């Protein structure tokens, strides 16, 4: 019961199942295409603080995947490495054949800890995590992915690092990592470009920790 789009010299139509269109010729299987599109193209927020609120954990439901033949370049991809407070892993290792998304502009790598209630992390809106040419219902550990959806039809990076605490819950906190001992408090009003600009002025000017302590920066509210 999965719909197919049909591309005409008019517009994009959705193929029926009850109505047979005699002129909708299919000459080969090469005219059928699976396309992975990103959610960012619909205006969903992409900052880390808001993104992680769309994900959550559950048990009793197995993971599954489907393939793509083509897809979009992502401006914002994510890569998670989350551990439980006791040091154990939250996310499963990716299985053979799963590789990261090939075309990301900024990768938001989040490392940290938090409660992990289930077996797997699932998307709450039912969107898929997009891996190289495979969409998945779950997040795999250490693998870069984009969020998105898959269409079927008839045809005729800069790496930004963050630390996280309380990753799997509602009230969580994040830091932007400049150096091993240098961090900036993260806010939802920051864009990837903003963070890169802060990394250049702080690092270049030497406003970094010299002692063994952690230097934590807070952006002026204005």
């Amino acid at each position: 019961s999965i719909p197919l789009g049909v591309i005409h010299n008019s517009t994009l139509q959705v193929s029926d199942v009850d109505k047979l269109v005699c002129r909708d010729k299919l000459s080969s299987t090469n005219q059928l295409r699976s396309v992975g599109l990103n959610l960012e193209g619909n205006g969903v927020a992409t900052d880390v603080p808001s993104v992680t609120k769309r994900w959550g954990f559950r048990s009793g439901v197995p993971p599954k995947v489907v393939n793509y033949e083509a897809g979009e370049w992502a401006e914002n991809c994510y890569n998670l490495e989350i551990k439980k407070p006791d040091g154990s892993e939250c996310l499963p290792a990716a299985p053979d054949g799963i590789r990261g998304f090939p075309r990301c502009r900024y990768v938001h790598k989040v490392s940290g800890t938090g409660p992990c209630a289930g077996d797997f992390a699932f998307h709450k809106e039912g969107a898929f995590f997009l891996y190289d040419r495979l969409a998945s219902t779950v997040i795999y550990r250490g693998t870069t992915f984009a969020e998105g959806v898959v269409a079927f039809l008839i045809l005729p990076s800069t790496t930004i690092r963050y630390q996280a605490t309380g990753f799997g819950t509602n009230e969580t906190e994040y830091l932007f990592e400049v150096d091993n001992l240098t961090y900036v408090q993260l806010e939802s009003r920051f864009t990837p470009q903003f963070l890169l600009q802060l990394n250049e002025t702080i690092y270049a000017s030497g406003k970094r920790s010299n002692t063994t302590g952690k230097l934590i920066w807070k952006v002026n509210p204005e």
Partner: antibody
Amino acid sequence: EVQLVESGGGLVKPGGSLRLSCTGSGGTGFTFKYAGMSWVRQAPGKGPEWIGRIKSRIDGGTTDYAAPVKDRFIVSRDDSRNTLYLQMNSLKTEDTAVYYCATGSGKGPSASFGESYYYYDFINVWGKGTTVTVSS
Amino acid sequence: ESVLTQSPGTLSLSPGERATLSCRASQSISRKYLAWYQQKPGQAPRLLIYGSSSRATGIPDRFSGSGSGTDFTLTISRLEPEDFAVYYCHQYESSPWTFGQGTKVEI
């Protein structure tokens, strides 16, 4: 700029227990983006003794204890209330001491960008010390 | 464990004279993990020096630490009347913390 002040002391009988507290201000909150906090005690006539310290949540939130208090004292924090606590069980009269809270903090350099603080693995800020007396 | 022992137990020097106090650790330790503290009755100890050789702020230049391995020293180039306090060593050990026993400095 950081200050922390101890309370919850006074006279307790041996074989009992008590919980000390230390509430501060001048920092950026003591739970996240902050130094962990320790307890140190000093009996009159003696030097300081490390009890243990609670790490910040960004550093895991665990407690590292000194051997002399293992399995008797617990170091914990009231998150976002900027308050450090010490639960001392199985009290003996040997535990009479002044109990101090201590913090690895203080303000760092500023920039046109924003403000900053440092969180250390040593102590810059000491509280006043609350005396705990354990006696019959 | 890694334990700090101070020597001499008491230092005796007129103000204006140089003073040194050493600590010997039972275990070798890197410089970045050492500190000394200054205590007077009624006060919590002041930091003075940390990281073996890095001065704490609010501390005069006459106070300078040095050392490596198991042997560390605090040197006061000229000991002033206001500096005749009890001094302690401290080490971080990358996890457990240790304090020295307390050494008295007298005129």
